[PDB]
């Protein structure tokens, strides 16, 4: 009934192709340990089962010691597909597995040639409808969920064309004279951001 | 008598699996040669089990069924089985093939009382195809009919008004078999189905069942 | 395939109604597990089975919950009265050893005040700007789905009647239209990036598809507007030079 698990670090921000080590700590003695990966669709994929020792399979590595009561998960040359939540299933009851808090991992794809720009897009059927787009910006940018409660903005996304990687953010508001230059004012954007006229 | 208050964990759910959600082991022409008797290749299409183990109270009377064609009727279990990993255990419910056959199926009448008031129970529910049938064969069929009409092994939330209960099998030849519905020891199937260890086989000639149900 | 199937995958119910979920695991697997996962949190243990009997039930688990294992390997989890906070993703797993746990897709439950709050999405495709093709020499199409409840949507791009994965980016969480409102409508956006020469070709067809998971034939519909069932709302756009 009583089993406490704390995963460190709670949040991880890492660049593309870089290495990282996330750990799982537990209170009582444990007979069975498991490492899972959660995708945005909500499905748990079993990566490793390490009750003791070290296992090496694919690009991911995992080590567990029952003496010092801790588990470790390694990610060699991390890709954008690795982005998600990593869980630590721990067993004390007879065979009952209890999941931890979860390690939030978000792999940021740093573009070789960044060019921040805010473009204005128009609807296919209607002439009045319009939507602002912020694209080709560096992954280090923090687009703030702001502000007027009449303007709707979205978080960053990663796309690959090839060799080529691009980051985008969508902002829309069906209000009188919604300027693209007035949009993303709450978010701190670079000085070299290109603002074309429609 | 019977106390539903003593929850003892997941005992209510497990008792519901034993009498309502049961895949009752039924066999007529089956012989064994392995106090426990093992039936090699009993399960034809089962991913979990292949063989069946039958446990008894005394080894002295176990040799009576051991070598002969015997009829099987009872509830089997997988958790906490004393055997590898593909065997199901059971307690009693074994009857011989000789003279245990009848022309027209026996229709045993059942009588039920709900805190004094008598309720009509159809005789088509409980049936036995043998002359001398085990208590297990009659109890499994009677508790299944009860569970469907008035939720017996369901929690107070899931409309389970019955708190105390008793099932009796009339004195036709010798003393009656008295058993309390909520008085079964343990929370798992290996302890709840242990009542049939004695392997009590009674005469099915013009006998009746009396069930006493109480809401408090 | 995941290995373990779960039916249904999405369910919508009114406050104080009965709901059930079926979990179909691998035939050989001896064990079964029940978990509850909320928004941005770890899955909490509910109850687990070993062969035919229920081994343990969580202390935090409400009395309105009942997990039953009928004839076979499958298990059914039921909720008596639907309350606030019940809206969570119910995960199911199976174990053989039981060394490794194989998880299913999980049922997404949404407990609404009224069934009238269910709205289908309005899909719209935005034509790429002339200023973008002149500056970066590539065109990006923005898809926009607005006014839908619950957030049970699946977005996929279709170019020339074929599913496209390359150059596709989608929002992780759908932003609510009215944030300070309970059972409020949601909004989602996705971008498809193609070369300027590809967009200018009039022979190329571009279509955005949003798979909405709505009501079933069991649910009663009395409102004047159309019934919001499990429909695939789409918006198309043709290439222009």
Numbering used by the authors:
A (entry chain A): 1 to 92, 96 to 165, 168 to 203
B (entry chain C): 12 to 45, 50 to 98, 101 to 233
C (entry chain B): 2 to 242
Task: Please give me the paper's original passages concerning this structure.
The SEA variant F47A, with a substitution in the MHC class II binding site not involved in TCR binding, was crystallized in complex with the human TCR variable domains TRAV22 and TRBV7-9 in space group P21212, and the structure was determined to 3.1 Å resolution. Attempts were made to crystallize the wild-type SEA-TCR complex, but this did not yield crystals of sufficient quality. The substitution in SEA, phenylalanine 47 to alanine, is not visible in the structure due to flexibility in that region. Furthermore, this change is distant from the TCR binding site and is therefore unlikely to directly affect binding of TCR. SEAF47A exhibits the conventional superantigen fold, as first described for SEB by Swaminathan et al.. Briefly, SEA consists of two domains: an N-terminal domain consisting of an oligosaccharide binding fold made up of six β-sheets (β1-β5b) and an α-helix (α3), and a C-terminal β-grasp motif consisting of a large antiparallel β-sheet (β6, β7a, β7b, β9, β10, and β12) packed against three α-helices (α2, α4 and α5), and a two-stranded β-sheet (β8, β11). There are four regions of SEA involved in binding TCR: the α2-helix (residues 20, 21, 24, 25, 27, and 32–34), the hydrophobic patch consisting of the β2-β3 and β4-β5a loops (residues 62–64, and 91–94), the α4-β9 loop (residues 174 and 175), and the N-terminal side of the α5-helix (residues 205 and 206). In the SEA-TCR complex, 16 residues from SEA and 19 residues from TCR are involved in intermolecular van der Waals contacts (distance between residues less than 4 Å). For SEAF47A-hTRBV7-9 there are five amino acids fulfilling either of these two conditions, Asn25, Tyr32, Trp63, Tyr94 and Phe175. Asn25 and Tyr32 are situated on the α2-helix, Trp63 is on the β2-β3 loop, Tyr94 on the β4-β5a loop and Phe175 is situated on the α4-β9 loop.
